[PDB]
Amino acid sequence: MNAAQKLGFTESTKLLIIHADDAGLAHAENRATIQSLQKGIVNSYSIMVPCPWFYEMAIFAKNNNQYDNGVHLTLTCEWENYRFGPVLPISEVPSLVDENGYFFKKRDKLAQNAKAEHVEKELTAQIERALKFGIKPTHIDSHMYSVGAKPEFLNVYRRIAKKYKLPLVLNQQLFEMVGLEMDLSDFKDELLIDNVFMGEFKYFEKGELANFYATALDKMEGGLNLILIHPAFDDDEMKGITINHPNFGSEWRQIDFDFFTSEEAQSKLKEQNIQLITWDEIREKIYKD
Amino acid sequence: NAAQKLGFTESTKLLIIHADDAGLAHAENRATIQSLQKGIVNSYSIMVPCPWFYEMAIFAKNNNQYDNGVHLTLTCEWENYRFGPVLPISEVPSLVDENGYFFKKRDKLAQNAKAEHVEKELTAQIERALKFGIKPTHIDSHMYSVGAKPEFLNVYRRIAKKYKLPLVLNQQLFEMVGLDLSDFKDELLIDNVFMGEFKYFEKGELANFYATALDKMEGGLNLILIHPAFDDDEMKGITINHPNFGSEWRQIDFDFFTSEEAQSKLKEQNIQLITWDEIREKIYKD
Ligand code: NI
Ligand code: NI
């Protein structure tokens, strides 16, 4: 059974969450995310609590709970000159940071250095700080899927989701792409996304990233589908953040925004009979009174 | 006056053109760097708690020719762009609001903060700058919040003596923050401090004010405090509903102090630029 079937739909039902990651990263990303929710077809998003523009996004989230909002759990900081670290004091989670007190750039350095106990404390602290600011998250997911950097970290992530009775992002392809050669028999109690779609560099470098998203909607099949995007205006802030990092860089993020506010994308939902869903709806199916 | 106590004649027009709030924002970092490179701005200071500190720090550690200090930060004036202490909140709890960010106003800081927490956090900001490779030549004070209470000013003066750095002390700044000169006999007092004012900004005359300041400048140690930044989306987002020293104002600062007009006024008035590093060297030599 695909996940649509597990959620009580027919097997051919094309369920879709159109999900903006990295809200809170930057002012341009906050503004583009908000406008893509209000004026486009994006219907869900998640927030990086450690990041410098978290407060602005937390104010929007607390006052606009109709948009499915989650916590984008953060244990890495991929940018060259724009650096951030944990919510908790460094002395409480010292295995998670480089010599400057910032998160490492790569999953493998996190796997090499981080202690599971520190991961668990810091991810719990990001969720708790979201709650303290009045956010009412409906899901948790993982920036650069760094929770998959070690099986022990994925297990911390699964336990934290159960503790807060929230759904989380799990998917066989994400597992493989972070080098996690697990077996799905351990996931009987969990809901796995059938298909996760995100932009790829080989389309971006042909100038065809927009065409990639059109093709993804054209070819969607029954099951639970998740599109992950990063809408942000390609202005000087974003160029400053994504310097020397064109993969999911500032030009790419603007393409995300434009595609998912277009008439083209909106018509494709209807033409392909795609059924939008949010994590809160999934949460309510899984966690009963 | 300070010009004589630094070894010059009384009529000498010493001037520091000093960019505050470096580290605040990417747009301010870029505008500050460009004004040092291509303007007549000759000094700046860095806000260590701010989100764009690291990028500024990389510039500072590899570009020591530019006089550079630590802009000590105990307040966060902005509506949606919030930052707090370098130290953990549990270690300096009296410095922060319920969100863990610095307060917006010196008055709240003075009502709440313990001088002990002030001393610990200001020390941590200087130490973090040092750890990142910055070799500061001076300290000064964001919104002059070290003047919010006399005990805070004393902390600030002790910290300057401990690191053997010059610091910004001035009677106009004192009376701005609401705070007797004979107590400062072994410290160097700036004779005149110039900063933009809203009454001129709202009439479209901010640059006129700076031009008049250069034309009229008198002998002694003069200090112009500015905040160059590009008036772009990022700065509009930081300075929303805060036009005083807001994004358009900061663009005027950049435009004027990279203009040939300003450089010409320097030549016409025979104003002599000087840095805090030179002042520190001269104090140490005395
Ligand atoms: Ni992410
Ligand atoms: Ni300042």
Contact A220, A2 (CB under 8 A): no
How many other β-carbons are positioned within 10 Å of the β-carbon of residue A87?
Answer: 22
Q: Exposed, middle or buried, B61 (CB in 10 Å: 0-12/13-18/19+)?
A: middle
Return all residues near A91 (Cβ < 8 A) that are at least 6 apart.
Answer: B88
> Cα-Cα-Cα-Cα dihedral of A161, A166, A171, A177, to 10°?
-50
Distance from CA of A159 to the nearest CA of B (A): 27
3-class SS of residue A18 = strand
How many other β-carbons are positioned within 10 Å of the β-carbon of residue B98?
Answer: 6
Q: What is the DSSP string of B133-189?
A: T---S-EEEGGGGGGSSHHHHHHHHHHHHHHT--B---HHHHHHTT--GGGGTTSPP
* Binding annotation of B for Mn(2+): 21, 71, 142
Contact A72, A46 (CB under 8 A): yes
Looking at residue A103, the DSSP 8-state letter turns out to be B
How many angstroms separate the first and last alpha carbons of chain A?
Answer: 25
Return all residues near A145 (Cβ < 8 A) that are at least 6 apart.
Answer: A107, A169, A174, A177, A178
Which residues in chain B have their CB less than 8 angstroms from residue A134's CB? none
Alpha-helical (H) ranges within chain A are: 3-6, 27-39, 54-63, 107-113, 116-132, 151-164, 172-177, 201-204, 209-219, 236-241, 250-259, 263-271, 279-286
Which residues in chain B have their CB less than 8 angstroms from residue A100's CB? 54, 132
CB of A59 within 8 Å of a chain B CB? The answer is yes
Contact A232, A253 (CB under 8 A): yes
Contact A72, A137 (CB under 8 A): no
Q: What is the DSSP string of chain B?
A: -HHHHTTS-TT-EEEEEEEEEETS-HHHHHHHHHHHHHSS--EEEE-TTSTTHHHHHHHHHH-TTSEEEEEE--B---SS-----SS-TTTSGGGB-TTSSBBSSHHHHHHH--HHHHHHHHHHHHHHHHHTT---S-EEEGGGGGGSSHHHHHHHHHHHHHHT--B---HHHHHHTT--GGGGTTSPPPSEEEE--HHHHTTT-HHHHHHHHHHT--SEEEEEEE-----SHHHHHHTTT--TT-HHHHHHHHHHHTSHHHHHHHHHHT-EE--HHHHHHHHHH-
Structural domain range at position B209: 2-285
C-alpha torsion sign, points B240, B241, B245, B251: positive
3-class SS of residue A243 = coil
Task: Tell me the structure's resolution in angstroms, rounded to a single decimal.
Answer: 1.9
Phi, psi of B223 (to 5 degrees): -135, 120
Q: How many domains does chain A have?
A: 1
Q: What is the CATH number of the domain that holds A185?
A: 3.20.20.370
CB of B99 within 8 Å of a chain A CB? The answer is yes
By C-alpha distance, the chain B residue nearest A237 is B234
Subunit contact A236:B51, Cβ cutoff 8 A = no
Element of type H or E holding A14? strand A14-23
Residue position matching structure tokens 């998917």:
A171
What's the CA gap between B41 and A271, in Å, rounded? 60
Contact B38, B106 (CB under 8 A): no
